[PDB]
Write an enzyme that holds these catalytic residues in place. Structure first.
Site, PDB file in Angstrom:
ATOM      1  N   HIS A   1      -6.142   1.188   6.421  1.00 33.23           N
ATOM      2  CA  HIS A   1      -5.314   0.262   5.849  1.00 33.23           C
ATOM      3  C   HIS A   1      -5.813  -0.970   5.617  1.00 33.23           C
ATOM      4  O   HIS A   1      -5.090  -1.788   5.261  1.00 33.23           O
ATOM      5  CB  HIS A   1      -3.970   0.330   6.703  1.00 33.23           C
TER       6      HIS A   1
ATOM      7  N   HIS B   1      -0.130   2.126  13.063  1.00 36.15           N
ATOM      8  CA  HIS B   1       0.434   2.817  11.976  1.00 36.15           C
ATOM      9  C   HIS B   1       1.122   1.770  10.937  1.00 36.15           C
ATOM     10  O   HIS B   1       1.671   0.927  11.681  1.00 36.15           O
ATOM     11  CB  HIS B   1       1.817   3.422  12.783  1.00 36.15           C
ATOM     12  N   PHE B   2       0.775   2.101   9.696  1.00 35.86           N
ATOM     13  CA  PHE B   2       1.458   1.400   8.647  1.00 35.86           C
ATOM     14  C   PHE B   2       2.681   2.066   8.249  1.00 35.86           C
ATOM     15  O   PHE B   2       2.740   3.210   7.931  1.00 35.86           O
ATOM     16  CB  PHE B   2       0.630   1.239   7.363  1.00 35.86           C
ATOM     17  N   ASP B   3       3.878   1.385   8.548  1.00 36.19           N
ATOM     18  CA  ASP B   3       5.289   1.799   8.754  1.00 36.19           C
ATOM     19  C   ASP B   3       5.792   1.879   7.290  1.00 36.19           C
ATOM     20  O   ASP B   3       6.419   2.596   6.587  1.00 36.19           O
ATOM     21  CB  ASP B   3       6.129   1.340   9.662  1.00 36.19           C
TER      22      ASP B   3
ATOM     23  N   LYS C   1      -4.328  12.638   0.507  1.00 35.62           N
ATOM     24  CA  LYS C   1      -3.198  11.614   1.323  1.00 35.62           C
ATOM     25  C   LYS C   1      -2.228  11.241   0.080  1.00 35.62           C
ATOM     26  O   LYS C   1      -2.801  10.769  -0.781  1.00 35.62           O
ATOM     27  CB  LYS C   1      -3.694  10.626   1.924  1.00 35.62           C
TER      28      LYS C   1
END
Ligand code: AU
EC number: 4.6.1.18
Length: 124
Positions: free
Chosen positions: A12, A119-121, A41
């Site tokens: 990210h 984590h990228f939400d 992905k």
């Protein structure tokens, strides 16, 4: 074993470019960051801000995570991001992506000591 923090930086972080280098950016970056290794992905976001500025979001606006966990944080300021979105034409192992640039508030999940993004939400 890759630490969750290092995996977040690989998947990210892209502080080198101010914004989606080119129409080629996602095709190159999804591959170079190893997000097309075992499969394509399907969606991924890259953040064009300093690591320190992204780490600082873990002390900003506390919001619910999409999974219902409480450890997500929304940036008070907008950040330069690139969304990468797998096309229809895209067939593994030739993973094809649309590069979109935007300025949006990011939402990241944080954990650990030190408390860092894992984590990228979402972006909003
Ligand atoms: Au804002």
């Amino acid at each position: 074993k890759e630490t969750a923090a290092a995996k977040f930086e690989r998947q990210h972080m892209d502080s080198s470019t101010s914004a989606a280098s080119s129409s080629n950016y996602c095709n190159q970056m999804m591959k170079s960051r190893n997000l097309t290794k075992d499969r394509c992905k399907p969606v991924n976001t890259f953040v064009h801000e300093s690591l320190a500025d992204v780490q600082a979001v873990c002390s900003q606006k506390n919001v619910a995570c999409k999974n219902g966990q409480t450890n997500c944080y929304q940036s008070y300021s907008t950040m330069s991001i690139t969304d990468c979105r797998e096309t229809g034409s895209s067939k593994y192992p030739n993973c094809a992506y649309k590069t979109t640039q935007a300025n949006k508030h990011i939402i990241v999940a944080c954990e650990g000591n030190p408390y860092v993004p894992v984590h990228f939400d979402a972006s909003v």
